[PDB]
Design a protein around this ligand. Structure first.
Ligand SMILES: C[As](C)(=O)[O-]
Ligand SMILES: C[As](C)(=O)[O-]
Ligand SMILES: C[As](C)(=O)[O-]
Ligand SMILES: C[As](C)(=O)[O-]
Lengths: 304, 303
């Protein structure tokens, strides 16, 4: 009656090859621990130094993904056991995007099944354009093009999955829509800031969980990112002065039940890659919804 | 800076005794130089059952009229203005009865320093819930749901959006109030212990962070005695059918637009208390400027 989920925490560099190794190891560990699906953070392929760097690295992501698809099938074959993978990546703009003068990268959550088949590419809807309190001005929209579609509910081994990315968590109407469409589980793969993480990360996960009566999965980037890329730095004629980076992610990856209880949480004693596991209870989810029938009580006559 | 008072109390079924407590809290709020005081849901009474509620609701109009007079009296005596936000009940109207709607109204009144009712908000989302490890409650057995989104009130503290208790759980409502211009939201409540321990703080902070508004949370607290000998005699009730015990969560608080609890009820004081907060419009504006959520919504897809 229980379904096992794995949630991964990691620290993306600008080196896709090294990031892939980490990703493959975590998927391998997830199959070992008999997780039905493994969830990895936003930007698990790479993080970049600036908007031009991002577009450069996005050109390498199709290869990363093809290699990942192969790694999944290899791992499924060798372990005699299925697993599905949800993972944040970037993708280059399409020909039509370019025709329309849009050369920004797509911030994409991939769902890949045990056969290495891509079932969904969810393009991030709400982009992180924020002045961080006691921190930098961040404008995701300079590097990333916003999505134009609400992601379909995924029939995963765990149950009905609603997909979202990072900043998406802050717009409750999105999570409300996902539940309305039939979601039982929401995910928010993220590269979340320290300053906003300390304040809101746990609050937002728990809020979305209780709002929607869904399990909430929170795969987060952690630690100080090594964004070094000597070959690109050479190509773009960058001075050592412009080379430096101190980008840092909140981590605190967790799983939350439909009542807002944290049932799994990352170990704070490491800033390296780690996996957390949780057993999801459909009976508990159904009980909670029965006892407090929020979706039978909404005022559609006034809102929406 | 503008000063708000948030009241925590414990309603009995005695409207006369409840009114005395309400008047004392409003008086105390004026002494402390609060410009508006916010009192919980059901500050006029709490009832044993649907039939008791209908009986007590008939007494509510007198309670409200006496409160209106009491507000102008306190303001005059103290030589200082205050506005009052307070949860009460109203009996069904003549038209309600003719239309077969014999249910009481759960209403949040906004009463200004002149004792004028500026708004009568009727609760939109009614508490029909099987409480985990608690009782099975069905508010809609005695209460009729509201028909309107309440207008933003230009209060002395700023733009106020109003809501009642369970309303807090439906984020679209708070989102709409912010879209209408809210700077401050209130959720006067009689909140259960089991859901309170779980969600009270979480939901308040969430709505504040969701909307970049100050959030005010006036709550009922402690064990209620809803005994009413006069009613119990009139309805010829046996002692075995009596349901006079209720418990409320309390933990009344004020929350800033960043989710920080800036005022909170003292857990050591039993019974009626008041918490004060100085609200900062510039902090609110700064938060909204730095994270421009309302310039970033996807109405093309969700609205
Ligand atoms: C990840 As692809 C290049 O098959 O859209
Ligand atoms: C917009 As990003 C997750 O590549 O910093
Ligand atoms: C239990 As009631 C309708 O007085 O809040
Ligand atoms: C049963 As009742 C809504 O009068 O507390």
């Amino acid at each position: 009656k229980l379904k096992r989920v794995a949630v991964a925490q990691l620290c993306s560099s600008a080196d896709l090859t090294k990031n892939l190794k980490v990703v493959k190891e975590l998927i391998s560990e997830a199959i070992q621990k008999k997780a039905d699906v493994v969830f990895l953070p936003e930007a698990s392929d790479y993080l970049s130094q600036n908007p031009l760097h991002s577009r450069y690295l996005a050109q390498k992501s199709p290869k990363f993904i093809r290699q990942l698809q192969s790694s999944i099938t290899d791992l499924v074959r060798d372990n005699s056991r299925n697993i599905d993978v949800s993972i944040g990546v970037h993708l280059p703009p399409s020909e039509q995007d370019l025709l329309e003068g849009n050369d920004r990268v797509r911030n994409v959550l991939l769902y890949i099944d045990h056969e290495g088949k891509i079932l969904q590419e969810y393009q991030k809807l709400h982009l992180f354009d924020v002045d961080v309190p006691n921190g930098p001005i961040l404008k995701e929209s300079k590097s990333v093009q916003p999505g134009k579609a609400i992601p379909d509910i995924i029939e995963s081994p765990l149950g009905k999955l609603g997909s979202a990315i990072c900043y998406d968590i802050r717009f409750p109407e999105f999570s409300l829509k996902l539940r309305s469409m039939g979601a039982e589980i929401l995910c928010f793969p993220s590269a979340f800031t320290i300053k906003t993480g300390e304040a809101h990360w746990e609050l937002l996960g728990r809020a979305r969980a209780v709002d929607t009566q869904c399990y909430v999965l929170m795969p987060g980037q952690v630690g100080m990112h090594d964004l070094s890329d000597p070959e690109w730095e050479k190509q773009s004629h960058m001075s050592a002065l412009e080379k430096s980076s101190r980008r840092e992610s909140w981590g605190h990856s967790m799983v939350i039940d439909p009542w807002g209880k944290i049932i799994a949480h990352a170990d704070p004693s490491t800033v390296g890659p780690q996996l957390i596991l949780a057993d999801l209870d459909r009976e508990l989810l159904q009980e909670i919804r029965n006892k407090m029938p929020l979706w039978n009580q909404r005022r559609d006559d006034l809102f929406h």
